[PDB]
Amino acid sequence: DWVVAPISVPENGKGPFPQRLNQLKSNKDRDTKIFYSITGPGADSPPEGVFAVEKETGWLLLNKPLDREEIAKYELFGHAVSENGASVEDPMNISIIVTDQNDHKPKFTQDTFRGSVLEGVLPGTSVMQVTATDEDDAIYTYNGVVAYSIHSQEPKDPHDLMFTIHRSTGTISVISSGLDREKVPEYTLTIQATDMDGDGSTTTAVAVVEILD
Amino acid sequence: DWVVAPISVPENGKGPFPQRLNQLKSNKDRDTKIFYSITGPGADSPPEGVFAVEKETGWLLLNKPLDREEIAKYELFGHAVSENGASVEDPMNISIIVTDQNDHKPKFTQDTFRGSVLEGVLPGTSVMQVTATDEDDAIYTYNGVVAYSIHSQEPKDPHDLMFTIHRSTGTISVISSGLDREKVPEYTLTIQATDMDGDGSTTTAVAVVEILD
Ligand SMILES: [Ca+2]
Ligand SMILES: [Ca+2]
Ligand SMILES: [Ca+2]
Ligand SMILES: [Ca+2]
Ligand SMILES: [Ca+2]
Ligand SMILES: [Ca+2]
Ligand SMILES: [Ca+2]
Ligand SMILES: [Ca+2]
Ligand SMILES: [Ca+2]
Ligand SMILES: [Cl-]
Ligand SMILES: [Cl-]
Ligand SMILES: [Cl-]
Ligand SMILES: [Cl-]
């Protein structure tokens, strides 16, 4: 059968609302006045009233802004009933696909990550790994693709930039010589995660690196 | 049967999340390891993952802040399954009632209301009626109870306060003499609606009153 195609709607629309999405129609409206209605989650069950349909015109409406991270797909049914009260079509599946906007900053899995490394390891040695997640799409876009960096290191002793971070994996490594527990037994690294693979919003956290004997 | 009572949770909770709500338990856990799960809108169907249950402990969790004006009541089912894979209880109804916080300001049904009145009507004469709605509860609290007032009138001719408004019905009336079309053919009233029956947040709109001949 011919049916309404899935309707794609970006999250966070500015309106105005109610917003026309697509117009339902039964061709039995030639012979009879038709009253349209819709059912399903988002229409007549939780969350109720996100979508509506204009009874006589068959216009499907979105009544407010959508949030992909709450519900990314709605599955509704359109109905068509004659003025005398008989259903004149089998209910039609209607799908609404909510598409992404970059509206989440990255979120570190901890506020303070802790790791350790032996003084005197080779430059290039992995120390630890930090992680930030991002609720946004990372399949079709970079909205949810996190890039990692180190913002600063304290103390600046002996050299200011003792560590680096793999920009995609969040693994922190030693890139210099000169680790010495007796001189500096612990470093605090301000670490950052930025979405749009580096071009977007940035969140900050801390990694503390204990220098072992 | 003994069952879990409806669980009341105010909207807009500050957490931390996940938040323990109530602990499910089958007393067959004496004889057998039990795995708990929950189903329904808010758990395994849209909106998915608002609630969860700890598999072994039976703790029901709320995972994020709720919004009474989106969904005010959730109807879930708790399940109890033995480690060998048999259901050992009939699923239990679980209700979550989301209680109100005053988080909506009043909203006027129009930005500009228009009415008219004959010059020379008696003081006390009704002119028009304006309306603001408020999404918040108005049954148990004043969160959704709107009080109306007039903020100002332009021009201030002949007297500054020609009209009043019924603080609950939003009906505007003439309270002075001296309406005269040839002198002032139209007035603009800045009107306000405030929730908590006057004690709360205030929204503003305009009513324009044409003086008829
Ligand atoms: Ca969103
Ligand atoms: Ca929501
Ligand atoms: Ca998003
Ligand atoms: Ca993002
Ligand atoms: Ca030493
Ligand atoms: Ca709310
Ligand atoms: Ca509320
Ligand atoms: Ca309110
Ligand atoms: Ca005159
Ligand atoms: Cl209509
Ligand atoms: Cl998308
Ligand atoms: Cl558990
Ligand atoms: Cl309430």
UniProtKB/Swiss-Prot annotation, chains A, B:
GO terms for biological process: adherens junction organization; calcium-dependent cell-cell adhesion via plasma membrane cell adhesion molecules; cell adhesion; cell migration; cell morphogenesis; cell-cell adhesion mediated by cadherin; cell-cell junction assembly; hair cycle process. Keywords: Calcium, Cell adhesion, Cell membrane, Cleavage on pair of basic residues, Disease variant, Ectodermal dysplasia, Glycoprotein, Hypotrichosis, Membrane, Metal-binding, Repeat, Sensory transduction, Signal, Transmembrane, Transmembrane helix, Vision. One of its GO terms (cellular component) is cell junction. It is found in: Cell membrane. Expressed in some normal epithelial tissues and in some carcinoma cell lines. Glycans are attached at residue 93. Disulfide bonds: none annotated. Residues 1-108, 109-213 form the Cadherin domain. One of its GO terms (molecular function) is cadherin binding. Interacts with CDCP1 and CTNNB1. It is linked to Hypotrichosis congenital with juvenile macular dystrophy: A disorder characterized by congenital hypotrichosis, early hair loss, and severe degenerative changes of the retinal macula that culminate in blindness during the second to third decade of life. Ectodermal dysplasia, ectrodactyly, and macular dystrophy syndrome: A form of ectodermal dysplasia, a heterogeneous group of disorders due to abnormal development of two or more ectodermal structures. It is an autosomal recessive condition characterized by features of ectodermal dysplasia such as sparse eyebrows and scalp hair, and selective tooth agenesis associated with macular dystrophy and ectrodactyly. Cadherins are calcium-dependent cell adhesion proteins. They preferentially interact with themselves in a homophilic manner in connecting cells; cadherins may thus contribute to the sorting of heterogeneous cell types. Three calcium ions are usually bound at the interface of each cadherin domain and rigidify the connections, imparting a strong curvature to the full-length ectodomain. This is Cadherin-3. The gene is CDH3. The chain holds residues 108 to 320 of 829 of the full protein.
